[PDB]
Amino acid sequence: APRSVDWREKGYVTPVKNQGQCGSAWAFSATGALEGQMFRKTGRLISLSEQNLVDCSGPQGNEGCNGGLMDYAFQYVQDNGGLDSEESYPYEATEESCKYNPKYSVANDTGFVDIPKQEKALMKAVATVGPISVAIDAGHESFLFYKEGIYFEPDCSSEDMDHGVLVVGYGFESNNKYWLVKNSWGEEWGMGGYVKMAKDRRNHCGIASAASYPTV
Amino acid sequence: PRSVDWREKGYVTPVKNQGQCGSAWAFSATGALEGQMFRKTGRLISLSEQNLVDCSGPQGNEGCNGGLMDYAFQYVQDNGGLDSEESYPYEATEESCKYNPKYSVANDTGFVDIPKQEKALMKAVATVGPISVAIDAGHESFLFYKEGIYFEPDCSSEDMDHGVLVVGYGFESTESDNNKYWLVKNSWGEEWGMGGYVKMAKDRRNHCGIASAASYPTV
Ligand SMILES: *[C@@H]1O[C@H](CO)[C@@H](O)[C@H](O)[C@H]1NC(C)=O
Numbered sequence: 001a002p003r004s005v006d007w008r009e010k011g012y013v014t015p016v017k018n019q020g021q022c023g024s025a026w027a028f029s030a031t032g033a034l035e036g037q038m039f040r041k042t043g044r045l046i047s048l049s050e051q052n053l054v055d056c057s058g059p060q061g062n063e064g065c066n067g068g069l070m071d072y073a074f075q076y077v078q079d080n081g082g083l084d085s086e087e088s089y090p091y092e093a094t095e096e097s098c099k100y101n102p103k104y105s106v107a108n109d110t111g112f113v114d115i116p117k118q119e120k121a122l123m124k125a126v127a128t129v130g131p132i133s134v135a136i137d138a139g140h141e142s143f144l145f146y147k148e149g150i151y152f153e154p155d156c157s158s159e160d161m162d163h164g165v166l167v168v169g170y171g172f173e174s175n176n177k178y179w180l181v182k183n184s185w186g187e188e189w190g191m192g193g194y195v196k197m198a199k200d201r202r203n204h205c206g207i208a209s210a211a212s213y214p215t216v
Numbered sequence: 217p218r219s220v221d222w223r224e225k226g227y228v229t230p231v232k233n234q235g236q237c238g239s240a241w242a243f244s245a246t247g248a249l250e251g252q253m254f255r256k257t258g259r260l261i262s263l264s265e266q267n268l269v270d271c272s273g274p275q276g277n278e279g280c281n282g283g284l285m286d287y288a289f290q291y292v293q294d295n296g297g298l299d300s301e302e303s304y305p306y307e308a309t310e311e312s313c314k315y316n317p318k319y320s321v322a323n324d325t326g327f328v329d330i331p332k333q334e335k336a337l338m339k340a341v342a343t344v345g346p347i348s349v350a351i352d353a354g355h356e357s358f359l360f361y362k363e364g365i366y367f368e369p370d371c372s373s374e375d376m377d378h379g380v381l382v383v384g385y386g387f388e389s390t391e392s393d394n395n396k397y398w399l400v401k402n403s404w405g406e407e408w409g410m411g412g413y414v415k416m417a418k419d420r421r422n423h424c425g426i427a428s429a430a431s432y433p434t435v
């Protein structure tokens with residue numbers, strides 16, 4: 001119910017990372033959400049290994065640099081019973097064979113929860129839980145070139161909502177409401193790697209596409 | 217090493233905004249102390265600038281009208297504590313002291329001043345963690361800075377009076393030993409610069425440094 005929420009301020013959120021030319025956004029979105037939930041549990045923020053996810057979470061349905069799903073990532077962590085740190089298992093921006101080492105695991109999870117495709121539901125989750133994984137439409141040139149301000153999706157379509165990102169908060173610029181959204185295109189994109197997305201729009205849509213978060 | 221970046225190592229809180237209050241000194245000091253507390257404990261906790269603004273007058277600080285990061289570090293020593301950002305929020309104006317020792321999350325033991333050589337600063341950055349320094353922030357092109365390498369347009373000791381935090385260095389090029397820069401965290405919020413950061417020209421050939429008033433707290 002609070003009118004603003006920002007989880008970075010609360011220490012839940014690692015610095016912005018860069019996926020490279022590898023279609024692995026699903027992995028950065030997943031690690032973001034798990035980093036948040038591990039922080040809540042332990043109080044220790046530890047950057048998590050996307051590469052671990054990209055290499056090893058095929059059996060759950062993920063396709064490495066060719067795409068994947070935050071939920072499949074959360075399921076891998078449960079099945080696997082851990083996930084290595086970013087430090088122990090660094091990002092290569094390409095799919096290699098699995099190198100999971102249990103001795104370097106710094107995260108578990110216990111399941112995951114899908115949120116309904118409603119901006120009100122997303123609000124309640126963000127206010128309550130921590131950073132939330134979602135997928136957005138990242139396809140448009142104006143989003144490529146984004147620098148500042150509230151970004152308005154020109155265009156509402158389910159199919160195109162397929163780039164994984166992390167909702168770390170919400171606020172208002174004033175009226176003029178926005179989600180605070182951490183991307184994985186490095187800190188030179190957008191507002192040091194962040195974007196404010198228009199929120200509670202009027203025209204009915206919609207970034208609560210495939211919203212979800214792990215349980216710990 | 218040829219690149220250092222303490223953010224990636226967990227040392228650095230998110231960019232804060234000092235507002236219209238002349239308190240960069242306090243944000244620079246808390247950034248440096250947040251680093252060294254992390255190095256010690258492995259817990260990263262955001263520290264109160266308001267606590268510094270309100271309470272470190274007796275060490276020589278002047279709240280919203282200026283001060284020095286060394287004075288901040290001295291206060292934390294003398295005080296025997298510093299409140300968390302959460303417990304003692306930033307208001308961008310000077311009020312009466314409200315330090316509560318029950319809410320202390322940081323100590324220090326003193327501080328170390330670094331010589332104004334870019335090489336002595338490089339060693340410290342490489343070896344200690346994020347370092348407090350003061351730069352010249354007065355120029356319009358620094359105000360409008362968005363990306364790339366920033367070149368200080370003159371060298372002038374008296375104008376280097378805006379406290380910031382050096383959190384690393386590296387190089388632009390595909391080369392290295394060319395287009396070197398310091399990574400510098402500002403306190404002008406995340407809409408200034410590159411997410412609140414600036415890459416400052418490093419190892420220049422006119423021998424103008426930025427290691428003006430360099431120091432870090434000991435813990
Ligand atoms: C800091 O040091 C003081 C005095 O030695 C001690 O009483 C206090 O518990 C310490 N506080 C923290 C947060 O380390």
Ligand code: NA
Binds near residue numbers: 054057058098
């Ligand atoms: Na795999």
